[PDB]
Write a structure and sequence with these properties.
This is part of a larger assembly, with five copies of chain A and two copies of chain B. By secondary structure, chain A is an alpha+beta fold. Chain A is built from one helix and four strands. In chain A, strands 3-2-1-4 form a four-stranded mixed beta sheet, with helices on one face. Chain B is an alpha+beta fold. Chain B has two domains: about 110 residues, no CATH class; about 220 residues, no CATH class. Helix content of chain B is about 20%, strand content about 20%. Chain B has six helices and ten strands, in the order βββββααββαββαααβ. In chain B, strand 6 and strand 7 form a beta hairpin. In chain B, helix 2 crosses helix 3. The chains are: A alpha+beta, B alpha+beta. Chains B and D meet through loops of B and strand 3 of D. The PDB classes it as immune system/rna/dna. Keywords: complex, inhibitor, immune system, IMMUNE SYSTEM-RNA-DNA complex. The entry is titled "Structure of Csy-AcrIF5".
């Protein structure tokens, strides 16, 4: 509702690679942009999209291998 | 009829980054193998000489930061101790086709604007603007602080056609001042050669060299750089000079800004001198802004009234509007 | 977000080249600056942007080829 | 954050020249000092800053054209 | 009306680095080809004579014991065994236009400041300041530790036009003391020549040569270098001297400090001598600071009062403020 | 860090003059000794500081103007 | 280090005097021997120390004021 939503999923068509979706104002601002082949690159792409498309506020969701690289403080704003 | 929402002009008078070299006077005619001027780095020890902040800090305890020095690092440039002439060399292109936009949005507005520019270029060829650009080239205005203490500035301008030179001009940059615009046969020749490429009749590529005589081992002033990812913690350098591969140089936009200072028509001039041709013609280094949109002498109001409303202004404001179209930029909506 | 976040991402329009973003208290101070063309220069640029602008604390994110040049005790502070 | 960190980075405003930064114990000891106009001068300046600053341990970071002059991981870390 | 947030002034009296050569007395009149002095390294073996600030029986001793020697490496510059005179040469450039600032965020504050400086120059010229600068040039204050045990000092000043020298002054630097500011005949002509360039009515470039007789084989003292990259390892070099192209030299800011020390009007007893003109009037090597901001005696208080509230101070404080903007710096709030 | 490391760096306070630093085994034995006023004297000083102060291994680092006088990848490593 | 190395360095404790080092096959044969007080005698002593102490593959190093008295073909064997 209020913040942007960044979702980092793992593409099931090949295991080990990831994709990011950015949703703002109830509509999809960015869809299926690729985010690397390891969880670190997925965390970097997620935080970059959160910074740029973040506006005032944002929430980062996604896989548990990806969110192990981001501290729990830096997942909401 | 309404103005477009996308309008993108391209710039004429394309300059280049000018590189600095050092040598001696009375050898300028063989000054093609003069060594460069390198940007040195030095550590200094000075005093605290800024305004202290005594709002809520220690009022009498930590305010003995004076009686203790501060040690800094700076970039600096210098001539050798046997050289007393600075040499600055750049190139310049004149392109032509100044009325057409490079990326438009509307159809009837573009076909009206082309006829509005065409009736001006029919009734008045590019004579005044080329004259003032030749004046700004003839006096070495593009040496900004290297022109202050000089005793002899000398400018050479070549018209390079197919590699080798076809026509040279030589000027003494201290006789041609910076205030008034007076005549000369060489200045008329250079003005017509600029106006040829400004109309579009030919191909104008010039090479401009300038020699300044300042003295032995003195300090020269290249461009200071703006760094936008530097970080604000502590221990930085705070003065970084601009150099192109171990040779101190000057930015190209600064030389274009020096060449653009032809605007002697604005509201509250009493002979103070020209400023650069900008929309809402302003000097941010002085804080003043001439040509505010409150008075109707703004660029956008003049252009809208000239094209949309068929209100032909005075001839000097026509010179200002056409000079802004030659300058380039993004206009629309 | 209190600490500084330095994210190194890879440009998918030209593979092999990297870019760096710095967060710095909820408003980005560096946007899509040119890092190197290899993981070593990207690691050097990330550690430079963490040295400045990271005065209390910082977090460095990035790929596994990039973070293989920094020891595990120097990425988070 | 115990060893001294030495970073060598290329200036993007003119390609080919490098600058070095040195941090020891959370305090930036050297900030953006000129290393040179080739990777060899950058490697020499980085090894000099690792010898002088950072007596117990150090880590040297830099580009791959610069770290090709230092022996591979034997002298880069300590 | 307030003071601007960005305000900055350029530097007048721009010197260069001084170069040092060695020769014999009574060949001063043909000293165009004397060889330079060179900095040489040497290793000494001495004793440990410093305060043992650790414990008497320290477990982790941060120093060494007294019964052992310590070996060090230092730089040193000497005269040759046949040469007993040292020659120091530099150049000076007087620019002019000391009122106008380079950058100014405000518009009204700039022209108010220009009116204030203009009524100062129209009231009295640049005569007292140029007399003090000519005194600091006449007695060789700039030689520093090389002036102390000297047997005789001589100063030669040349005024250089487009080609050759057009005017020559010769002074005996030991009759002109470092304390008093007396009058002469040639010194008034030199002061008028400096004042004409300080006002703006000419181009003034001087060449200064100084000869000092300190005995043959003795030690000379160039400027010592401050290095902010070198750090924290046992085995370093303790003393590095400044040199340009294998020749010992003195920094340019050290000669600027030696020519700038004309301030004899500070709050305390100014019978002991003059200090350098700077904001907050501080001599850091002695560890003191005259002109503290407790009273209204520092630079910024006088300047803001004079410009914003029209309160003209005494004439000596006006001399101090005008010399402080001849010096230059960043004065912004 | 087993081999003796010898570095030659150019001083930016005046260009064209060099300095040499030697480190044998965890300790600095020569710090900022005057190399020379041209690349040839700096290369000669580097080879002199590598001849002595050397175990059966050493390494020389320098710019791409000084390392031209040293024979190409033959006398630079051991 | 198979070619024999001959280096000529100026002693910084008094400017203008030179000293030559000669190494052959891992161990040094001449350490800090005196040369003249001018570059001519230094270059001559470098040539003489190049004739002896290596018949194949000598290298002669020195300043540009020293290596200007010998021809360009007589500096590297």
């Amino acid at each position: 509702s209020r913040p942007t939503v960044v979702t980092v999923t793992e593409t099931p068509r090949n295991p080990g690679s990831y994709e990011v979706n950015v949703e703002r104002d109830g509509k999809m601002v960015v869809g299926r942009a690729r985010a690397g082949s390891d969880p670190g690159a997925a965390a970097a792409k997620a935080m970059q999209m959160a910074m740029e498309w973040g506006s005032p506020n944002y929430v980062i969701l996604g896989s548990n291998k990806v969110l192990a690289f981001i501290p729990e403080q830096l997942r909401v704003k | 009829l309404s103005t477009a929402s996308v309008l993108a002009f391209e710039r004429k008078l394309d300059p280049s980054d000018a590189l600095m070299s050092a040598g001696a006077w009375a050898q300028r005619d063989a000054s093609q193998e003069w060594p460069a001027v390198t940007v040195r780095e030095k550590s200094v020890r000075g005093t605290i000489s800024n305004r202290l902040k005594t709002k809520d800090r220690d009022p009498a305890k930590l305010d003995a930061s004076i009686q203790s020095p501060n040690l800094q690092t700076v970039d600096v440039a210098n001539l050798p101790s046997d050289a007393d002439t600075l040499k600055v060399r750049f190139t310049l292109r004149v392109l032509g086709g100044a009325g057409t936009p490079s990326a438009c949005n509307d159809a009837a507005y573009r076909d009206k604007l082309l006829q509005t520019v065409a009736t001006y270029v029919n009734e008045q060829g590019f004579a005044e603007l080329a004259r003032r650009y030749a004046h700004n080239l003839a006096n070495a205005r593009f040496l900004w602080r290297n022109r202050v203490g000089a005793e002899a500035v000398e400018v050479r301008i070549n018209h390079i056609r197919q590699g080798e030179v076809a026509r040279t001009w030589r000027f003494d940059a201290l006789a041609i001042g910076l205030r008034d615009f007076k005549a000369d046969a060489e200045l008329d020749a250079l003005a017509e050669l600029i106006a040829s490429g400004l109309s579009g009749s030919g191909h104008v590529l010039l090479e401009v060299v300038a020699f300044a005589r300042i003295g032995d081992g003195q300090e020269v002033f290249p461009s200071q750089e703006l760094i936008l990812d530097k970080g604000d913690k502590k221990g930085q350098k705070s003065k970084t000079l601009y150099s192109v591969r171990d040779a101190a140089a000057i930015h190209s936009q600064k030389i274009g800004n020096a060449l653009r200072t032809i605007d002697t028509w604005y509201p509250d001039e009493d002979g103070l001198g020209p400023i650069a041709v900008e929309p809402y013609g302003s000097v941010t280094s002085q804080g003043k802004a001439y040509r505010q949109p409150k008075q109707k002498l703004d660029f956008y109001t003049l252009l809208d009234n000239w094209v949309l409303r068929d209100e032909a202004p005075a001839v000097e404001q026509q010179h200002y509007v056409i000079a802004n179209l030659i300058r380039g930029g993004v206009f629309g909506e």
